[PDB]
Amino acid sequence: AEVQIDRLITGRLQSLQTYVTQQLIRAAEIRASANLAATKMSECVLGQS
Amino acid sequence: STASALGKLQDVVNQNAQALNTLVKQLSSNFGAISSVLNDILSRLDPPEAEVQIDRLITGRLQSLQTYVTQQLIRAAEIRASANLAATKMSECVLGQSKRVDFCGKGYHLMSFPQSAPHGVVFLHVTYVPAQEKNFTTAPAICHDGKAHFPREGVFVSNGTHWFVTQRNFYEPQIITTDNTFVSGNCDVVIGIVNNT
Amino acid sequence: LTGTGVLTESNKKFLPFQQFGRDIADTTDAVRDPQTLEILDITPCSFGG
Amino acid sequence: CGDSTECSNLLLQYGSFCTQLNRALTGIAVEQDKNTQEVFAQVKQIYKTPPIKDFGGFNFSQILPDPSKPSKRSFIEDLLFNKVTKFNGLTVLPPLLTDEMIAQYTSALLAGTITSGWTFGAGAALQIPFAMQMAYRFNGIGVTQNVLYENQKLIANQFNSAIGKIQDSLS
Amino acid sequence: QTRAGCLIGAEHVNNSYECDIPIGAGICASYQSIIAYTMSLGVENSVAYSNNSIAIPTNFTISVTTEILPVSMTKTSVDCTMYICGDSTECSNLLLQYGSFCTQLNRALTGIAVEQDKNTQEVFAQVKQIYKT
Amino acid sequence: KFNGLTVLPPLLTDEMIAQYTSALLAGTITSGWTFGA
Ligand SMILES: *[C@@H]1O[C@H](CO)[C@@H](O[C@@H]2O[C@H](CO)[C@@H](O)[C@H](O)[C@H]2NC(C)=O)[C@H](O)[C@H]1NC(C)=O
Ligand SMILES: *[C@@H]1O[C@H](CO)[C@@H](O[C@@H]2O[C@H](CO)[C@@H](O)[C@H](O)[C@H]2NC(C)=O)[C@H](O)[C@H]1NC(C)=O
Ligand SMILES: *[C@@H]1O[C@H](CO)[C@@H](O[C@@H]2O[C@H](CO)[C@@H](O)[C@H](O)[C@H]2NC(C)=O)[C@H](O)[C@H]1NC(C)=O
Ligand SMILES: *[C@@H]1O[C@H](CO)[C@@H](O[C@@H]2O[C@H](CO)[C@@H](O)[C@H](O)[C@H]2NC(C)=O)[C@H](O)[C@H]1NC(C)=O
Ligand SMILES: *[C@@H]1O[C@H](CO)[C@@H](O[C@@H]2O[C@H](CO)[C@@H](O)[C@H](O)[C@H]2NC(C)=O)[C@H](O)[C@H]1NC(C)=O
Ligand SMILES: *[C@@H]1O[C@H](CO)[C@@H](O[C@@H]2O[C@H](CO)[C@@H](O)[C@H](O)[C@H]2NC(C)=O)[C@H](O)[C@H]1NC(C)=O
Ligand SMILES: *[C@@H]1O[C@H](CO)[C@@H](O[C@@H]2O[C@H](CO)[C@@H](O)[C@H](O)[C@H]2NC(C)=O)[C@H](O)[C@H]1NC(C)=O
Ligand SMILES: *[C@@H]1O[C@H](CO)[C@@H](O)[C@H](O)[C@H]1NC(C)=O
């Protein structure tokens, strides 16, 4: 049974790694958007730009 | 005196060191093979089945290396964005005065100084902060001889009995005169007109 | 214990029951010869692009 | 594995991939709270509007919080919230800041930018009538402050109509 | 019992402070016996707004603040036959049939290494001469 | 430098970075913002 266990393990590990990488990319993009929003609030709400 | 004020650079260095350390540590893993050392399985088994163990070790190490490379790429992109922001701040706040709010420190920006750091830059911002306020009383415009007068640059205030013109960010009263006020129309539309001379 | 490198003399002290040492990430750093019982030092010989 | 001793034992010799995955997930989870903190926590104090509302004719009743509602959210916030719309080893963590605290931050910012203007963004909030803050704001775009005082009612009516149109379009 | 689960060993209080250890859903803990409470946003004040009153400062202070920004990280390069084979002929022969994987890795590492130097140069080299006090 | 990992030195040494910083600081103290344009 070890061969089948290894096959399932490696497949699931590969899928998990792919999901984690996609999450990292999306988190970076969201962080950039949040930085832009913070800059807009600091500049346009607390003063006249 | 106080430590822990340079968390970002220390965190970057620690992350790099930890990534390198775990990449090195990954060598000792077995990956389901007979052993983690090539020489033992080479001298213990003839090629026909030893090639399977060699292949398993090779694919495991290749996967680890690929993961390390991807993580390095992500960190490189992050650092590039941060340093682009740093370069923009250097260009805008050191080589000239800035008007955009809260870009360089808190308060009204005055000037800045750069300093080096092992893997970064440190900005010292000199700004200006008001304090010791008062209350006074205000009117938008003053009607004299039937015509309304507005301040050129400043605001009307009163200490209870007399009216003065000051500037917004500092208290310095002056006697109202034609030289610092301008006339426009008659005192019939503005809401808040006060009689004075 | 098989491996390549250059062997120098070392001043590190071993308790009388060890046979070899390592520093971190499980990499051999020093070894004691089984005949003369002295602590040597192993350094990877130079390489580079 | 899903509660399997043999699978766990087999996985034990695959290195330390899982620690790295967990660390990355924890980092990207913390980053969200950091983003919220840096975008919303912009004020040192919590201001509140005076009970008497007379802002020179401007009407802010549709953006100011309503104490009647339990959530203390304004009409536009409720419209936005209404507009926007199981266990296998994965979990969802709750945000550090709930909706009420975010609403309180927004209300504090909106109440501080009306009574004080831009003064509270540098030091301490300085009171000033709204009809004069607007006159200051025209003076910063090339138009003399003369214009506002002769067209106060028209400007107030246009602003109220615009905000009502925005509310209708959102609804 | 809180919204994020439950705490054991901490005692709930009715107060509220600017806490230091986040817990979740507004709840957070501190030492002061370990206690847990609801975080406080800050001190609340009401500005005395009117329609004929202002507040003009009479004095000023000058403050110097600091901020820190990283600009670059260490440049690294990684070999393959040294790493995944450790100077073995059989391993090299077996690896030879996996196409060209290591070329991409070396290319990416070289790209980021060049990017670091370009980044530092663009950050710091803003002047054309060297002035002296 | 253990089993195939190499750390490449930076192109700019710390002395020249310090000289850049000193040049910027001496330029901004004496001339103001005019030396940037
Ligand atoms: C408001 O300011 C005016 C301007 O100084 C004050 O008028 C003078 O005040 C000084 C001292 O307070 C007196 O010695 C002068 O005789 C005043 N001259 C006039 C023409 O009034 C005024 O007293 C101030 N009022 C208050 C309540 O402080
Ligand atoms: C500033 O606000 C006060 C308070 O509402 C206004 O004073 C009122 O003015 C109306 C119109 O003359 C009177 O009917 C009220 O009796 C006044 N109330 C008080 C308490 O005096 C004042 O007019 C406002 N200033 C303006 C609009 O310029
Ligand atoms: C400001 O002065 C003008 C001119 O004296 C005042 O206008 C007239 O004042 C007289 C005397 O009080 C009244 O009998 C008239 O009815 C006023 N005419 C108008 C059109 O108002 C004006 O009332 C004064 N305003 C203030 C606030 O003192
Ligand atoms: C193991 O190594 C040698 C084996 O003969 C011995 O050690 C030395 O042996 C030579 C010649 O046999 C002598 O001249 C030396 O005096 C020996 N040195 C010591 C320290 O004994 C001995 O059998 C063993 N040595 C040790 C250190 O275990
Ligand atoms: C500000 O706008 C709101 C919204 O239109 C006004 O509230 C309305 O007031 C009228 C008259 O009392 C009512 O018939 C409506 O039902 C109210 N609408 C809502 C949504 O409650 C409010 O009166 C305005 N304030 C001012 C000072 O003009
Ligand atoms: C300015 O006038 C106000 C009253 O119009 C003074 O009273 C303050 O009012 C606010 C809001 O009601 C309170 O939060 C303060 O505590 C009050 N101050 C007191 C009672 O001393 C105010 O003091 C005056 N001065 C300033 C600088 O605002
Ligand atoms: C503005 O603030 C400064 C700093 O607090 C005041 O200067 C101080 O004045 C007191 C009293 O004269 C002295 O004892 C201190 O030594 C001064 N400090 C410094 C750094 O010189 C200044 O007086 C304030 N301005 C006004 C008008 O009160
Ligand atoms: C205060 O704490 C007690 C228990 O310590 C609790 O029963 C009560 O609900 C809390 N709040 C108030 C307002 O008493």
Tab-separated table of C-alpha atoms in Angstrom, chain E:
chain	number	residue	atom	x	y	z
E	1	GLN	CA	-16.251	31.872	25.736
E	2	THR	CA	-15.604	34.451	23.006
E	3	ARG	CA	-16.429	34.662	19.308
E	4	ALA	CA	-13.005	33.263	18.326
E	5	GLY	CA	-13.222	30.222	20.612
E	6	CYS	CA	-12.551	30.186	24.330
E	7	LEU	CA	-9.848	31.277	26.758
E	8	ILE	CA	-8.686	29.275	29.777
E	9	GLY	CA	-6.550	30.884	32.476
E	10	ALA	CA	-7.675	34.480	31.852
E	11	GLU	CA	-10.234	36.465	33.848
E	12	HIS	CA	-12.713	38.792	32.157
E	13	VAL	CA	-12.999	42.423	33.278
E	14	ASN	CA	-15.422	45.241	32.484
E	15	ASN	CA	-12.728	47.845	31.782
E	16	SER	CA	-11.156	48.836	28.452
E	17	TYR	CA	-7.580	49.829	27.612
E	18	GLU	CA	-5.372	50.238	24.567
E	19	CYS	CA	-4.247	46.620	24.659
E	20	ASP	CA	-1.066	45.012	23.347
E	21	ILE	CA	-1.839	41.315	22.759
E	22	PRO	CA	-4.566	40.858	20.122
E	23	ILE	CA	-6.971	37.956	20.519
E	24	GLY	CA	-9.734	38.565	17.987
E	25	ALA	CA	-13.266	39.863	17.430
E	26	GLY	CA	-12.361	42.965	19.431
E	27	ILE	CA	-11.348	40.939	22.489
E	28	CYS	CA	-7.714	41.206	23.562
E	29	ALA	CA	-5.644	40.316	26.608
E	30	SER	CA	-2.943	41.801	28.822
E	31	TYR	CA	-0.999	41.003	31.985
E	32	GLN	CA	-1.457	43.939	34.399
E	33	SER	CA	-2.945	37.682	36.625
E	34	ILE	CA	-3.647	37.583	32.890
E	35	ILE	CA	-6.866	39.424	32.029
E	36	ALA	CA	-8.924	39.801	28.856
E	37	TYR	CA	-11.206	42.660	27.843
E	38	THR	CA	-12.497	44.730	24.923
E	39	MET	CA	-10.006	47.117	23.346
E	40	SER	CA	-10.652	50.855	23.593
E	41	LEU	CA	-10.274	52.951	20.450
E	42	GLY	CA	-9.133	56.046	22.332
E	43	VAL	CA	-10.087	58.983	24.493
E	44	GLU	CA	-13.319	60.628	23.348
E	45	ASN	CA	-13.777	64.403	23.218
E	46	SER	CA	-16.265	66.819	21.662
E	47	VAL	CA	-15.071	69.990	19.950
E	48	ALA	CA	-17.112	73.055	20.939
E	49	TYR	CA	-18.388	73.738	17.437
E	50	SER	CA	-20.328	76.959	16.910
E	51	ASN	CA	-21.010	79.283	13.981
E	52	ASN	CA	-19.060	82.348	15.163
E	53	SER	CA	-16.061	80.825	16.958
E	54	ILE	CA	-12.604	79.653	15.875
E	55	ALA	CA	-9.356	78.478	17.480
E	56	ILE	CA	-6.117	80.206	16.444
E	57	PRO	CA	-2.777	78.903	17.786
E	58	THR	CA	-0.420	81.263	19.586
E	59	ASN	CA	2.762	79.174	19.939
E	60	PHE	CA	4.608	76.474	18.022
E	61	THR	CA	6.932	73.522	18.543
E	62	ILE	CA	9.324	71.778	16.159
E	63	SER	CA	9.593	67.986	16.276
E	64	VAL	CA	12.015	65.659	14.488
E	65	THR	CA	10.692	62.223	13.536
E	66	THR	CA	12.374	59.206	11.962
E	67	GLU	CA	11.385	56.496	9.516
E	68	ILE	CA	13.241	53.468	8.145
E	69	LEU	CA	12.924	51.945	4.667
E	70	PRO	CA	14.753	48.846	3.378
E	71	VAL	CA	16.187	49.098	-0.124
E	72	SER	CA	18.001	45.833	-0.960
E	73	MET	CA	18.829	42.307	0.180
E	74	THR	CA	21.701	39.863	-0.228
E	75	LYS	CA	22.681	38.636	-3.692
E	76	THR	CA	22.882	34.840	-3.822
E	77	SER	CA	23.736	32.231	-6.440
E	78	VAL	CA	23.135	28.480	-6.331
E	79	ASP	CA	24.829	25.660	-8.228
E	80	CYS	CA	23.077	22.440	-9.242
E	81	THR	CA	25.546	19.585	-9.765
E	82	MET	CA	27.159	20.545	-6.460
E	83	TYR	CA	23.768	20.676	-4.734
E	84	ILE	CA	21.540	17.892	-6.089
E	85	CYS	CA	24.373	15.523	-7.034
E	86	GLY	CA	27.307	16.316	-4.758
E	87	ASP	CA	29.977	15.520	-7.375
E	88	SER	CA	28.689	12.122	-8.499
E	89	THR	CA	28.888	10.808	-12.054
E	90	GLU	CA	25.784	8.608	-11.849
E	91	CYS	CA	23.698	11.453	-10.431
E	92	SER	CA	24.959	13.771	-13.173
E	93	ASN	CA	24.035	11.240	-15.859
E	94	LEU	CA	20.553	10.756	-14.398
E	95	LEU	CA	20.021	14.519	-14.084
E	96	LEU	CA	21.161	15.084	-17.679
E	97	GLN	CA	17.877	13.629	-18.997
E	98	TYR	CA	15.662	16.151	-17.154
E	99	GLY	CA	16.109	18.730	-19.909
E	100	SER	CA	17.356	22.191	-18.944
E	101	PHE	CA	15.826	23.103	-15.580
E	102	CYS	CA	18.798	24.718	-13.845
E	103	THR	CA	19.336	27.318	-16.573
E	104	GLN	CA	16.033	28.981	-15.667
E	105	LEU	CA	16.936	29.014	-11.965
E	106	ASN	CA	20.334	30.577	-12.644
E	107	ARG	CA	18.726	33.124	-14.971
E	108	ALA	CA	16.166	34.155	-12.349
E	109	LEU	CA	18.791	34.428	-9.610
E	110	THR	CA	21.041	36.533	-11.850
E	111	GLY	CA	18.084	38.747	-12.734
E	112	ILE	CA	17.241	39.464	-9.111
E	113	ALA	CA	20.938	39.998	-8.320
E	114	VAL	CA	21.217	42.644	-11.046
E	115	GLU	CA	17.908	44.155	-9.926
E	116	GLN	CA	19.242	44.671	-6.395
E	117	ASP	CA	22.245	46.685	-7.600
E	118	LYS	CA	20.144	48.724	-10.032
E	119	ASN	CA	17.674	49.409	-7.219
E	120	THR	CA	20.343	50.655	-4.815
E	121	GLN	CA	21.950	52.787	-7.529
E	122	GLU	CA	18.649	54.427	-8.460
E	123	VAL	CA	17.798	55.015	-4.791
E	124	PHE	CA	21.050	56.703	-3.789
E	125	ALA	CA	22.641	58.188	-6.944
E	126	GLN	CA	20.548	61.351	-7.187
E	127	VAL	CA	23.369	63.899	-7.610
E	128	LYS	CA	25.835	64.598	-10.409
E	129	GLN	CA	28.668	66.120	-8.341
E	130	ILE	CA	30.121	65.668	-4.844
E	131	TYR	CA	29.680	68.774	-2.704
E	132	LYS	CA	31.731	69.507	0.407
E	133	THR	CA	30.879	71.495	3.516
